[model samples]
Target: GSHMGQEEFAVEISGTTVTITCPSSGDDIKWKPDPALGDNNKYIIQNHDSSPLTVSCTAGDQEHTMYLNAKVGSADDAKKDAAKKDDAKKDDAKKDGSVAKLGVHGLSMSVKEVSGKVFLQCQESKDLNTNYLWKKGKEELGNMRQLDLGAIYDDPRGTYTCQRDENVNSTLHVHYRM
Candidate 1:
């Protein structure tokens, strides 16, 4: 009858051949497409496809169905899945204030404070000739890749923006405790 619950096994396809063992040594076991070679105890299949395989067994009056699920050895699909996970992690980092990202050109600005001085660096590309324009609201600050604020406090803390030719840009919010 078809009332028996199905059983499944997961196997990683490392090669062209897969070996399966039966629950009962002497029981009658029949595969849907039949294996490449086998006995009543064990069956070997030369499966080159990634699809699932099924087998049926009968022992006395019981009928059972066993499913074999395969995870292909090909790493391309696995790598794409992992890449999606990494993209999600970046969003989490931005939400927690650990990393800041802005602009459509993948521009980013980092703020580092050493002693009483603060430094803001704008990054857009790896090219050594990349130039950055620093600004505060509408006033131009500098024309270097990094902005050097010699000391804090005296320079009113506010939003500082940096861009590469006004097309790619990132902003850093600065604050001080007086």
Candidate 2:
């Protein structure tokens, strides 16, 4: 059996502070603020003793730092643990890979009220023959014809996706909020 792990998580942003809880652990990870960047707000981790450890930061503003407690585990054990985790993650991704992806590109927009129009462009891929269908959530909007800006409006919030014809898998998604 494949080991389970969190592939994605969500965060609720408030005025200045962001309180994040790891979806898997459900524990309060340490939060240290940094002031070097623009807003100068970030998290940092430090090692008490000089030891070889693998620390990684993912899905942040390129400045977030995560530190592992050095006294808790040896470097070899940590590496082995990380390798096992990586293998499990790869297996999970392989099992979940089902559909061809579409890439959305060349989108241009302006501020408009609820009834105003919008345009969405998808990146041209080698799969030009791939039949494309547009969708708003689960409902099928239509097929790709021409880049028509006037056809879509703001009321739907423009949270739509371009999917493959044979399968309803999303290749690209255009998301907007009013």
Candidate 3:
């Protein structure tokens, strides 16, 4: 049976505001609480607490759910919470005695889109504490686990590579769409 589609996005909560881009039109979208509207089809949410929000969007007869997660709290509180989680994960890796690797599947990075914006993320080892090096054409783009591209206006279209180690890497190409 074909169930309703579901998607999730990670929002870095450095402050009180977290913006989410809905895939469908505003008329077909509904939020549990009031959220402000931003330019370029982005929804503004004021999540000053450590709780996740779920948004529903409809297209035709199908429904899609978008979940937004963030660690919104004081600096010390956030740090302590993250430390406890990382410590718990570190035990599993230590027991196995093997560092995390990339490209666990049949090769190539996974391409994901949210409201036309593309995301390059390391999804396999999401819970493990590992660093990701994202680069394009010998230049480093970022070091975070996910690289968020702006609305696809043909800004940058080329092969992007992501690696957690020297010999282990995954790459994906960006293309133009109309």
lDDT of 3 at 15: 39
Please give, for residues 1-178, the per-residue lDDT of candidate 1 as tens digits.
5322122212222234455554433476543335344445445644234443334433343333343334333422211332212121222222121144555533334555566776666644446655555666556555565567535645445555555545322333344332
Candidate 3 has a TM-score of 0.31
Best model number under lDDT = 1
Q: Report the lDDT tens digits of candidate 3 across residue range 31-90.
A: 322334332334564434343333433333323333333443333221223332212122
Error of 3 at 37 (Å): 44
Please give, for residues 107-127, the per-residue lDDT of candidate 2 as tens digits.
Answer: 221212233554443323335
lDDT of candidate 3? 0.40
TM-scores vs. true structure, each candidate: 0.32, 0.28, 0.31
RMSD of each: 26.1, 18.2, 16.6
Which pairs clash in model 3? none
lDDT of each: 0.43, 0.29, 0.40
Candidate number achieving the greatest TM-score relative to the actual structure: 1
The order of the candidates by TM-score, greatest first, is: 1, 3, 2
